[PDB]
Amino acid sequence: PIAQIHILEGRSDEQKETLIREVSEAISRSLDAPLTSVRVIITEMAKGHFGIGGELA
Amino acid sequence: PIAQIHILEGRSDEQKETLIREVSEAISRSLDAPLTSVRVIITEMAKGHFGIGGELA
Amino acid sequence: PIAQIHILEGRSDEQKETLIREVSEAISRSLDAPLTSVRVIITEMAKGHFGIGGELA
Amino acid sequence: PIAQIHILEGRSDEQKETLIREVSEAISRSLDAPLTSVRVIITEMAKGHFGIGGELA
Amino acid sequence: PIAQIHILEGRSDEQKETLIREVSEAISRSLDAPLTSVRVIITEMAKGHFGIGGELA
Amino acid sequence: PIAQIHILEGRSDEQKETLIREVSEAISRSLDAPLTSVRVIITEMAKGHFGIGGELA
């Protein structure tokens, strides 16, 4: 499986490193698929590039 | 709804702020869905990262 | 500009046609870009594929 | 945060429901983000649309 | 490298198989990357979901 | 067709320029579609934003 997560900028390297592993584990557990086949892509968004209800977050 | 718009870099903060609101309004109008449920993601592409007809824009 | 809009399935072809035109006009307006240069992708989501808070919405 | 997970088709609704909840809880854990603010998109891939090394896997 | 290719539906399995192999070989060539490390995703678009200039193309 | 390729950062401008053309040619050949209708988006990922098997590449 291939997961792309869109998150707001500001997180540290450690939180994003935990994000990749815990999500890959949750995908491997829920789908009974090999952990080694799971790939995770983290995409950071600037505050001016993400909107909720037509307004910036 | 969740909209991701791929645009070329070079726009100002104001044009992208208008982009998020006007697109979210157009999605809310066309789908009769609550404006607050609409999310918009702006993804900027460098000139060397976007091609048309096999050539750079 | 290229826009991909994730929406829950269930809309008619007429509503999804309205969604493409209203969003394209909104993108062309906010960025002062040629309308013919704007492309919109509609990606439908089944009720079993979209979640909010880990729960299927 | 918004997550889009590309998986090969074939899973049941119960497995894809488990996938949405376990991933959302993993994202909320790693980023200390509100669970209700996490959205997950499941995009199924036919066996004829996914390739590894130019060969259909 | 991971490639997602949005195409209008209608192609045969043989053409979409050719598309995956030719693109993977092109990516492996340009980046000097291992072919087995290249994955290609084909995302079909209905004629009612793709627009050019706000009009369904 | 619209192709988005997720590649690791570190490539030069020339390798990415070759990537756009060779992939657009492979898409145009495999689908018998006009080369001018093919668009390619290159998305770079930092080393801390891409995982394989729950670990960083």
Numbering used by the authors:
A (entry chain B), B (entry chain B), C (entry chain A), D (entry chain A), E (entry chain A), F (entry chain B): 1 to 57
Quoted from the paper:
The enzyme 4-oxalocrotonate tautomerase (4-OT, EC 5.3.2.6) catalyses the tautomerisation of 1 to 2 in the breakdown of aromatics in Pseudomonas putida. It stereoselectively catalyses the asymmetric Michael-type addition of various aldehydes to nitrostyrene 3 by employing its N-terminal proline in a manner reminiscent of amine organocatalysts. The hexameric enzyme exhibits a characteristic “arginine claw” in its active site that is essential for the stabilisation of substrates in the natural and promiscuous activity. We hoped to be able to modify and improve the industrially interesting Michael addition activity in an unprecedented manner by changing the active residue’s electronic and steric properties by atomic mutation.
The protein variants obtained with the helper plasmid present exhibited full incorporation of proline analogues and complete processing of the N-terminal methionine. Even the structurally very similar dehydroproline 9, which differs from proline only in the presence of a double bond in the ring structure, could not preserve the enzyme activity. We chose again the 4-OT variant with analogue 9 incorporated (4-OT-9) for further investigation and solved its crystal structure. The crystal structure (crystallographic data are listed in Supplementary Table S1) suggests that there is no significant difference between the tertiary structures of 4-OT and 4-OT-9. The average difference of hetero NOEs of those residues which show chemical shift changes between 4-OT and 4-OT-9, so for residues close to residues 1 and 34, is only 0.03. This indicates that even around the site of incorporation, there is no measurable change in flexibility. Since the analogues are structurally very similar to proline we suspect that the loss in Michael-type activity is mainly due to changes in the fast dynamics of the 4-OT active site. In the crystal structure of 4-OT in complex with trans-β-nitrostyrene 3, the secondary amine of proline is perfectly oriented towards the double bond of 3 where the addition of acetaldehyde takes place. It is very likely that this precise orientation is crucial for the Michael-addition activity of 4-OT and it might be disturbed by the substitution of proline with its analogues.
